[PDB]
Design an enzyme around this catalytic site. Structure first.
Site, PDB file in Angstrom:
ATOM      1  N   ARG A 136       5.219   6.466  25.094  1.00 46.60           N
ATOM      2  CA  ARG A 136       5.245   5.025  25.324  1.00 46.60           C
ATOM      3  C   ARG A 136       5.985   4.722  26.618  1.00 46.60           C
ATOM      4  O   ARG A 136       7.156   5.074  26.746  1.00 46.60           O
ATOM      5  CB  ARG A 136       5.937   4.313  24.157  1.00 46.60           C
ATOM      6  N   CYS A 175      -6.839   2.183  18.627  1.00 48.48           N
ATOM      7  CA  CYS A 175      -7.259   2.081  20.016  1.00 48.48           C
ATOM      8  C   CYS A 175      -7.367   3.467  20.649  1.00 48.48           C
ATOM      9  O   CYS A 175      -8.343   3.764  21.344  1.00 48.48           O
ATOM     10  CB  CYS A 175      -6.254   1.219  20.808  1.00 48.48           C
ATOM     11  N   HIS A 194       0.759   5.764  26.775  1.00 46.07           N
ATOM     12  CA  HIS A 194       0.459   4.482  26.158  1.00 46.07           C
ATOM     13  C   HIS A 194       1.430   3.358  26.519  1.00 46.07           C
ATOM     14  O   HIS A 194       2.646   3.562  26.579  1.00 46.07           O
ATOM     15  CB  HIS A 194       0.482   4.716  24.644  1.00 46.07           C
ATOM     16  N   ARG A 245      -0.865 -10.247  17.218  1.00 46.40           N
ATOM     17  CA  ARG A 245      -1.522  -9.773  18.443  1.00 46.40           C
ATOM     18  C   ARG A 245      -2.918  -9.267  18.150  1.00 46.40           C
ATOM     19  O   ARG A 245      -3.889  -9.650  18.807  1.00 46.40           O
ATOM     20  CB  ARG A 245      -0.734  -8.631  19.103  1.00 46.40           C
ATOM     21  N   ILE A 246      -3.009  -8.393  17.160  1.00 44.98           N
ATOM     22  CA  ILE A 246      -4.291  -7.831  16.784  1.00 44.98           C
ATOM     23  C   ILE A 246      -5.268  -8.923  16.346  1.00 44.98           C
ATOM     24  O   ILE A 246      -6.360  -9.046  16.905  1.00 44.98           O
ATOM     25  CB  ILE A 246      -4.141  -6.831  15.629  1.00 44.98           C
TER      26      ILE A 246
END
Ligand SMILES: COc1cc(OC)cc(C(=O)N[C@@H]2[C@H](O)[C@@H](CO)O[C@H]2n2cnc3c(NCc4cccc5ccccc45)ncnc32)c1
Ligand SMILES: COc1cc(OC)cc(C(=O)N[C@@H]2[C@H](O)[C@@H](CO)O[C@H]2n2cnc3c(NCc4cccc5ccccc45)ncnc32)c1
Ligand SMILES: COc1cc(OC)cc(C(=O)N[C@@H]2[C@H](O)[C@@H](CO)O[C@H]2n2cnc3c(NCc4cccc5ccccc45)ncnc32)c1
Ligand SMILES: COc1cc(OC)cc(C(=O)N[C@@H]2[C@H](O)[C@@H](CO)O[C@H]2n2cnc3c(NCc4cccc5ccccc45)ncnc32)c1
Lengths: 358, 358, 358, 358
Positions: free
Chosen positions: C249, C166, C194, C12-13
């Site tokens: 989360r 982030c 988040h 993903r990153i």
């Protein structure tokens, strides 16, 4: 000669339709949205709703709210790409609407309260020329599905037209080529995995008419009935009494998929059907029916304006190896976006035809 | 002498409260729910809603719908564990409710339309003796939070009481032991991560009063305001003007958490605060305030009836190493379940005290 | 002179970083992504992942998969807007990577396995010149937050740089102007709501290190710890031991928000703070720190590339009326998108400065 | 004589099965779970996982973690209702498991790595007697569906049995009565709206084998294939090459539904089929095949242990008015809970039959 239109009911449906107009860059030039009607005339709120969409993101046009007169305390006029749209107060009866006074010829009825042919006509009594119901209609209104039977529109006989529903606009195209390419359709059952909608509830709530429909929408799989199956029977006569289907509301804010299982008239194959759909999507159905060869998921169809986009891989990989009569067809659709563009397409068509016949 | 109660408004709140009565095994013996009032008297629909709950599952008691008379077309009587509950037709003005004719003394106002002290008093004019509003009230209604200030209830002065809000019932307990254990509280800011609720929308809809609150609930993080902060100032006078907070509505159908950040009056440590809360939870706050040493998540607090359940690990692990004044306390709460039990506990308390003073 | 970069770890990153490069139209001209490294070299699969994104939609550029040699069975080369990217096989030890052989100078370490300064240096031993860890680093690696302390980068001393996280990239900008504008910051606690990430599980699963972190992600509010608090202490020395924070989360695939609660050094007001942040956002923090006056929700920040965008309404509306020291600041951030753009910014900055100093 | 069982693989499936045993109150008396095998032996973590379930809530039994010897640093023994369960270290090859040394006769293979008949036999080589694979098996292993063909189990011929899949345990029962009641089944296609599972990803991730299955699970409708259709052909011979189906993974953590569309052999009616399924559900399919007349939704089937529960309303309301051959049948199933109870039932059946034949 810009088409004078009016939107009665500025909710999800109404706005979507309006945004579709603006998105197609028809605002001002092709279509003149003289005004929008709703329980509120707060143009600032309408601008907010239009500038920010959870599912469809930000608009490609500029939206601003102004005041008709520097007198008014709260904006009552919307300004999209320069064009001015009037925010008119709603009425209990469509006949009380100043349509004639405003110069509105085509009224998009999207309040969901006037789906009855008789009630909808009120707009014409109010001064309107034609009415397009952004939903299934009752009372004997002409139902049309672009790419399937718009040619059946009679400028002299049809004054209250129905654009059917989003689901119907996804199934009809498929059924249309299935019958046109002479594949035949003895009987068929369709299931639509549908994203939840405004009529549903966030948490368990009240729904006397639809008990299941009252349950928390984003945490359940909710069965529900749908007329999109029978409705296709009105756009495609030959399918009357042969088609029926149900729906399954699932935890997604937008985009749905149709799962059609049907029995063909003559022996054929899933490959034949595959090629025929693709061929139709590239020819007489382009813009309405599309297709994909990719491994896509709901998210990938957001902002796709095709009424129905056939899933080739899903279809081919889930049918019987050498079957000749019993088949399953899978087609996606952005239940909000596509339908909205079709309402616009329907209006432009009628208008172009109403003018042609003089 | 079973407490004669009547529930005005049988929606989520109303049912939950009623279910809390049944769940506690009070129905019949301790509390006599003479009747429930709503826009509908369809007991079959109410049975359905009670027997099946998305978040709380199935009830531990039996629920059946019957007819008051074999003539009635649709059941209008609810039968829980043998006890009969009357389903009565709603009225625009509480004063028109046949409370006196039904023999109801305690009315649970949960329609959300009579949170104003003056309007709620109508029930009494209708024949009721006491009214408990299952939500924050206005107009000078005594607000009580079980475990914090029920002793301030005056049988002769207070006739219209408010059970405050779910969030307040979670924060008050904490603030209460923080001040009682003489930790002090100069100022404090609290943020609640709240599950979405019935007032929200499945997809972007209409919300003139709260613009963000109109956005798709299960797909967004939605900031909102909350009076839980100031309200605690009425239950615990010493905190007036010292507290304030905000809310973040997130994609969960139930269970919320409170994030309290405050500055203590005198030097201390998070370990001190921790042991104190646990001590209070095991002593004078038992049943109201609880705690956990486990690595839990929101789902773990479903059906937890404690107004506020302190999170030791989360707290201990997220404060400054040797801070002595600025701290953060975390406590969970089932915003539906716990609050409902509290309403029941308030009624029982009021009833016991009304009777005691004769 | 195109910057020669290599991406280690195409998850993903890594992809986001790559897409950020392409999105900024840097691919080919400014930056030369010589190759990407992962457990698979299946270019067709990578193309699929880049052409379709659940959250960020479709790319503005064209992506196609081809073969290095007409001999290979499965494509192993990616072609974006004409530029050719090599899909290289992963290695256990970075020192075994053919960086030198490929002509790669700058390596983007995004596997999450080499966050340790010592282990990251393996890339340099492999032929690379500089390493940028797209995550918090350990082992004494220089941490840099664009817009806050990129000037502290030393072409001669720093060879393994960390872009931080982030969350840190959202908080630091705020804290930066708070201290720069001399608002002061005695102590401060931050909570970040988040969106869930790749490290989480769809259904209750295994997570020995983070018990709570293993529970169903899209159906729970999951508390967790965060180093973004202490990390800001390394980018802004003065704040060491003054800040701390935690994370929650929640059920959203992307976009998060920071809730900062702090006590200022000197008397001030929330209005002063508001104007200052807006000023900083329009001047020396433009592009890094932004702000909004609108009633937005998480979905409105999707694809927003500012490291941190301050919420003016939410902040002004939730602070004490006349408070002078204790405040709360709200800022959003697209935890995926923005952070990716920062990695690219860090790389370009470093490369420009490494060349200048010669 | 308590059945000596061992669980190889203590993930979702494993635990679920173990909890099914305990839930049924079989632990200790009927079944003796000598031990469980996994990559970890941290009993404390297992207790945590068992005491807290996002979907199924809290257990009706007590779970505690202790130490085999006061020497060990971390508990390695589980204590449910008094019964002691050993937490053994996993092995790469089943033959290396001390099954014989522990006195384990029946091993539950639920690691998902040994679904191959040949590999699974390794447990028997390790000292075990019988092995039940909690998933579809390959290599010619006997597949059994309780309530459909458990009688075909041969104590002397079958040593490695497969309980099939959750979906198969839902469709098989239906098909079974459809054929047994002589309704016949020319050809059939089944679609299953399935909750997402452990194999999926929270955010777009890696999935080389199943590209779509790698996309964000709780935010998409994800098409996929399923062998549950063909699998019924091995449990019900007459259906080979007649059935086939697909799946649609939707945003729900648990509970799925089957949508069966089939053509009957002889003329009949949906009413006939409806009454037949209900009759079967009350007689020879009781405990396996159930049904409902209520307006239920996915959440209403959580903790329902029936392999398949027929939806009478949904079925009767969505078929063609007077159709005689083409029909659609709907049935729900708690893909986690029900399947687990079946595994236990299969084991108890095999054991009882293995002993009976001596
Ligand atoms: C955004 O602004 C707001 C504010 C609001 O609260 C006051 C409600 C709505 C809302 O419902 N908005 C509705 C929603 O967005 C959409 C329906 O899918 O159209 C809107 N709508 C509902 N009724 C409408 C109407 N006439 C019907 C009507 C008019 C007058 C009285 C009536 C009394 C009883 C029954 C019907 C009545 N004309 C135009 N738009 C309408 C919108
Ligand atoms: C479950 O059955 C149904 C069916 C239905 O539609 C027909 C609506 C509802 C519903 O709204 N249900 C509401 C919901 O379940 C709950 C509020 O949280 O209380 C219900 N409710 C709404 N108004 C109520 C009332 N008096 C107000 C009132 C009474 C009479 C006329 C009025 C006219 C205008 C304005 C108010 C009027 N008394 C008791 N319960 C009420 C419930
Ligand atoms: C699409 O391609 C696939 C396929 C796959 O399944 C086999 C897994 C992944 C995956 O995990 N992909 C990971 C994911 O996309 C991302 C981490 O967030 O980086 C990936 N990743 C993990 N390890 C990596 C590595 N070297 C480490 C390594 C390499 C070789 C052996 C090792 C043995 C022991 C310890 C480390 C070992 N180099 C590059 N990318 C890596 C990607
Ligand atoms: C809480 O405990 C933990 C901790 C952990 O990380 C440290 C991983 C897991 C986990 O993956 N846990 C797996 C997961 O919960 C489930 C499979 O869906 O079973 C678990 N599992 C995986 N392999 C297992 C095995 N033998 C296979 C095996 C054993 C030894 C080495 C192997 C090397 C290569 C290939 C296979 C290997 N025996 C028992 N349970 C197993 C569980």
């Amino acid at each position: 000669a810009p088409i004078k239109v009016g939107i009665n009911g500025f909710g999800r449906i109404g706005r979507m339709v309006f945004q579709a107009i603006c998105d197609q860059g028809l605002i001002g030039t092709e279509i003149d949205v003289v005004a929008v009607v709703d329980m509120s005339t707060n143009a600032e709120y309408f601008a907010y709703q239009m500038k920010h969409d959870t599912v469809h993101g930000r608009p490609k046009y500029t939206v601003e709210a102004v005041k008709s007169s520097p007198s008014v305390e709260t904006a009552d006029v919307l300004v999209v790409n320069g064009h001015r749209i009037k925010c008119v107060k709603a009425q209990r009866n469509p006949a009380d609407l100043p349509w004639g006074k405003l110069g509105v010829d085509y009224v998009i009825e999207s309040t969901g309260l006037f789906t009855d042919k008789l009630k909808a006509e009120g707009h014409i009594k109010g001064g309107a020329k034609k009415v397009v119901i952004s939903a299934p209609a009752s009372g004997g209104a002409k139902t049309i599905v672009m790419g399937v039977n718009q040619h059946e529109y009679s400028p002299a006989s049809h004054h209250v037209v129905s654009n059917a529903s989003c689901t119907t606009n996804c199934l009809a195209p498929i059924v249309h080529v299935l019958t046109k390419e002479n594949f035949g359709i003895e009987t068929g059952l369709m299931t639509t995995i549908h994203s939840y909608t405004a009529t549903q509830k966030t948490v368990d709530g009240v729904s006397l008419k639809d008990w299941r429909g009252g349950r928390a929408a984003a945490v359940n799989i909710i069965p529900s009935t749908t007329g999109a199956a029978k409705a296709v029977g009105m756009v495609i006569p030959s399918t009357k009494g042969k088609l029926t289907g149900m729906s399954f509301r699932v935890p997604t804010p937008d985009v749905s998929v149709v799962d059609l299982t049907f029995r063909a008239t003559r022996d054929t194959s899933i490959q034949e059907i595959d090629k025929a759909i693709k061929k139709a999507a590239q020819t007489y159905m382009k813009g309405i029916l599309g297709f994909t060869d990719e491994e896509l998921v709901s998210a990938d169809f957001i902002n796709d304006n095709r009424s129905s986009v056939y899933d080739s891989k899903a279809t081919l990989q889930n049918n019987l190896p050498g079957e000749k009569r019993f088949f399953k067809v899978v087609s996606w659709y952005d239940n909000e976006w596509a339908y909205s563009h079709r309402v616009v397409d329907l209006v432009r068509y009628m208008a172009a035809k109403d003018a042609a016949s003089s």
